[PDB]
Amino acid sequence: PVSMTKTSVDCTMYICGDSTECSNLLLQYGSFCTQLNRALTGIAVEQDKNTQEVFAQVKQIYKTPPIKDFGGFNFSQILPDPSKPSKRSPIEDLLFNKVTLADAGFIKDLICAQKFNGLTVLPPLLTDEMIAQYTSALLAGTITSGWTFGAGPALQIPFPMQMAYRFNGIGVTQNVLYENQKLIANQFNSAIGKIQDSLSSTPSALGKLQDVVNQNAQALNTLVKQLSSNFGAISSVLNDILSRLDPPEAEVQIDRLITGRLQSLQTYVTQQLIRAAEIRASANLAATKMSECVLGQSKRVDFCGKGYHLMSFPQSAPHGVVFLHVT
Amino acid sequence: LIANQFNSAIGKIQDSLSSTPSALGKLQDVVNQNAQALNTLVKQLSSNFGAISSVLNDILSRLDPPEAEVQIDRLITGRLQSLQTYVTQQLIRAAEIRASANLAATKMSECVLGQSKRVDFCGKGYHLMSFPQSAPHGVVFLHVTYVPAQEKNFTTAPAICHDGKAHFPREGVFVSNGTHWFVTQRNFYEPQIITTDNTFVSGNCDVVIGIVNNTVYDPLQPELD
Amino acid sequence: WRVYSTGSNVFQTRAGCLIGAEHVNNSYECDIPIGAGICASYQTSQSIIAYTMSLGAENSVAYSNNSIAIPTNFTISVTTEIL
Ligand SMILES: *[C@@H]1O[C@H](CO)[C@@H](O[C@@H]2O[C@H](CO)[C@@H](O)[C@H](O)[C@H]2NC(C)=O)[C@H](O)[C@H]1NC(C)=O
Ligand SMILES: *[C@@H]1O[C@H](CO)[C@@H](O[C@@H]2O[C@H](CO)[C@@H](O)[C@H](O)[C@H]2NC(C)=O)[C@H](O)[C@H]1NC(C)=O
Ligand SMILES: *[C@@H]1O[C@H](CO)[C@@H](O)[C@H](O)[C@H]1NC(C)=O
């Protein structure tokens, strides 16, 4: 995972929905809602910072040459396809179809009910078509320049010679590769096809992403349920209390409602803060993996997949990243 | 040359920090956040939370304690809940600072006391060394790194056939001006003549894709002949 | 207030719509993030302009199957990092 969905909560619409007397009683509680709004906009900034940290690793956009004479290898499943409006790999299309996202919030469900009570969804800073541009640029740089573009200017180098360098990094003499090129090419292409159909057949692979969305969805959902509890007053609808009692004794009921709703809102925000810290930790892990397993050749055991690491390829997913380790 | 580049680079660090004001924001915001949070706590004393007034000595000097109990209880609830919120937020920020401190300790152990080989862990480029300096509640690393930048192009081949046998570089790569062939290390252009003592032989030259025909000079033969 | 709702430079983005900024055809790096790839800045005779953010310079590397690039000269670099 890299980021979660940015959420903004407006107090005065949530608590005292269109009631001047309710808000005038609310300002006796001081400056709570400024603190709550500040915490939420802090999380909302931090999400954009996380995505910028993971993907904006280089500052130039390379492109692959059109000719595909890569010495027998076949990168047709991770290279971009010009046949679609979304310039993706087919593997990225499998990733975009496996996750059933929610929370559309279109410009005019449960989503509209969430909209009607001060809960808004801010759209992300990076769209779905720039993340693809970074990922395709990293693919282009890796397959045409080795690791030299991770340290300075891009230096072109033929691909099987790069693979000879990468066996020499393991501890194998490079003449192993040049005498067995076709076997390695066939194993690589078969393995890539196995990734494709294995991900296509298994439904339960991407749960690490999905649960995150679900948790946020579930948390937001239970917030709306807290509008329907009366907290010990005679009713839970504020307009009822304003349309039945005089204000000098309706202060008693309204104060109880303010207390209950404010406490529930505080609980929600604390839980979202802790989840934000967790997602930030995983994002720093992802940034370290992108720096080391992709842009270089790590030698730490089991950091870049199981076995002796050769290279990696990144791919994008909605709110996350997917690494292919070649080992 | 390297001495001059190093001294000029250090001077550029000096005047770059001296001219740019917005460098140390990663430190400053931390202090600001704590300052801001603490300031908020003080002005939570001034809200009445639904009572008569926010000054306690007013209520003690206006009411008898059978009703001062009712008013004071509301004040106690409000202030205690605000203080709780402050403590929880400070706990979360403390966990964040501890994570950054463990990152700083890892960088101090690896990028300074040794020579790391992880890419982009100790600055951009191949890492040479580091130097630490202190900062108010923080640390500042100067990474000294090596960046190669003047490229030129050559035409290669994966191996050389000489006598029905393949020859491979013991370390480096075969390059060609267009007429001759040389062995070069992978990060600095320097031609050396293809001999036996920087190559090795393995198999025959009927298998490897793209092997080119040339000759390999023997260091023993003109001494013997 | 109503002194800005007159407009005549109104621009509809994926986040909503923007009033008081003039949409351009260039692509610059981001200054103030608005969202959905749109950023805004204060530049030139001075006003607030909004744009699609620019990811970086486009580049192409001359790949071949028998061509290599090698460096000849080098540079020592010193960078700072604050924690
Ligand atoms: C790389 O592998 C892909 C696998 O998709 C190859 O594409 C297939 O090519 C055959 C040959 O005509 C077609 O019958 C298939 O329909 C293609 N697959 C798809 C999904 O359309 C591609 O040819 C390979 N490229 C190289 C250079 O080997
Ligand atoms: C390798 O790079 C260094 C530094 O870029 C070059 O040294 C420069 O040489 C020119 C000669 O006209 C001087 O004007 C500069 O002052 C030198 N730089 C420094 C920092 O003193 C060196 O010439 C380059 N090597 C080659 C073969 O060109
Ligand atoms: C390199 O590509 C050219 C394409 O014109 C081809 O003729 C040649 O055989 C290739 N050589 C190698 C070693 O792949």
Smallest Cα distance from C70 to chain A, Å: 7
Query: Residues of B187-215 as b/e, b for ≥16 C-beta within 10 angstroms?
Result: eebeeeebebeebebbeebeebeebbeee
Are A299 and A170 in contact by the 8 Å Cβ rule? The answer is no
Strand ranges (DSSP E) for chain A? Answer: 7-9, 60-61, 119-121, 311-317, 320-326
> Which one-letter DSSP state was computed for residue A124?
P
The pick from C63, C64, C65, C67 for probing ligand 3's pocket by mutation, whose C-beta has the most ligand atoms within 8 angstroms, reads: C65
Are A293 and A47 in contact by the 8 Å Cβ rule? The answer is no
Intra-chain end-to-end CA distance of chain A, in Å: 23
Are A257 and A238 in contact by the 8 Å Cβ rule? The answer is yes
Task: Look at residues B146, B147, B143, B144 and name the one whose alpha carbon lies nearest to residue B107.
Answer: B143
Tokens standing for residue A187: 């194993």
Tokens standing for residue A309: 């690491």
- Cβ of residue A247 closer than 8 Å to a chain B Cβ: no
Hey, are the CB atoms on A270 and B168 less than 8 Å from each other? no
Partners of residue B140 on adjacent β-strands: B133, C82
Return the ligand number nearest the Cα of B210.
Answer: 3
d(CA A290, CA A304): 10
Residue type, A31: S
Of C35, C65, C69, the CB nearest to A123: C35
| Interface probe, candidates C31, C63, C68, chain B, greatest B C-beta count within 10 A | C68
Task: Kindly tell me the sign of the dihedral angle through the C-alpha atoms of B24, B29, B31, B32.
Answer: positive
Return the ligand number nearest the Cα of A190.
Answer: 1
Query: Residues of C45-74 as b/e, b for ≥16 C-beta within 10 angstroms?
Result: eeeebbbbbebbeebebebbeeebbbbeeb
Pairs across B and C, CB distance < 8 A: 114
Chains that touch A (3 or more CB pairs under 8 A): B, C
Of C70, C72, C79, the CB nearest to B123: C79
Residues with CB under 6 A from ligand 2: B 4-5; C 73
Interval between CA A197 and ligand 1 midpoint (Å): 15
CA B61 to chain CA centroid, Å, is: 62
Which DSSP string do the residues of B9-56 spell out, in sequence order?
A: HHHHHHHHHHH-SGGGHHHHHHHHHHHHHHHHHHTTTT--TTSS-S-H
What's the angle, vertex CA A132, arms to CA A126 and CA A136, rounded to 5?
140
Atom of ligand 1 nearest to the CA of A76: 1
Are A6 and A121 in contact by the 8 Å Cβ rule? The answer is yes
d(CA A23, CA B141): 51
Interval between CA B151 and ligand 2 midpoint (Å): 15
CA torsion angle B179 B185 B188 B194 (round to 10): -30
Q: How was this structure determined?
A: cryo-EM
If phi > 0 it is left, if psi is from -120 to 50 it is alpha, else beta; for residue C56 that is: left
- The upper half-sphere exposure of residue B88, i.e. CA atoms within 13 Å in the direction of its Cβ, equals 16
Are A65 and C63 in contact by the 8 Å Cβ rule? The answer is yes
Interval between CA A74 and ligand 1 midpoint (Å): 9
In angstroms, this model's resolution equals: 3.8
Tokens standing for residue B85: 């919120």
| Interface probe, candidates C63, C70, C73, C77, chain A, greatest A C-beta count within 10 A | C63
Hey, are the CB atoms on C76 and B100 less than 8 Å from each other? no
Hey, are the CB atoms on B144 and C76 less than 8 Å from each other? yes
- B138 contacts on C by Cβ (under 8 Å): 82-83
Interval between CA B160 and ligand 3 midpoint (Å): 16
What's the angle, vertex CA B122, arms to CA B118 and CA B124, rounded to 5?
90
- Residue A115: C-alpha distances to residues A161, A275, C42 (Å): 57, 22, 33
Return the ligand number nearest the Cα of A71.
Answer: 3
Tokens 């300790």 belong to which residue?
B105
Pairs across A and C, CB distance < 8 A: 73
Q: Is A67 in the pocket of ligand 3 (CB under 6 A)?
A: no
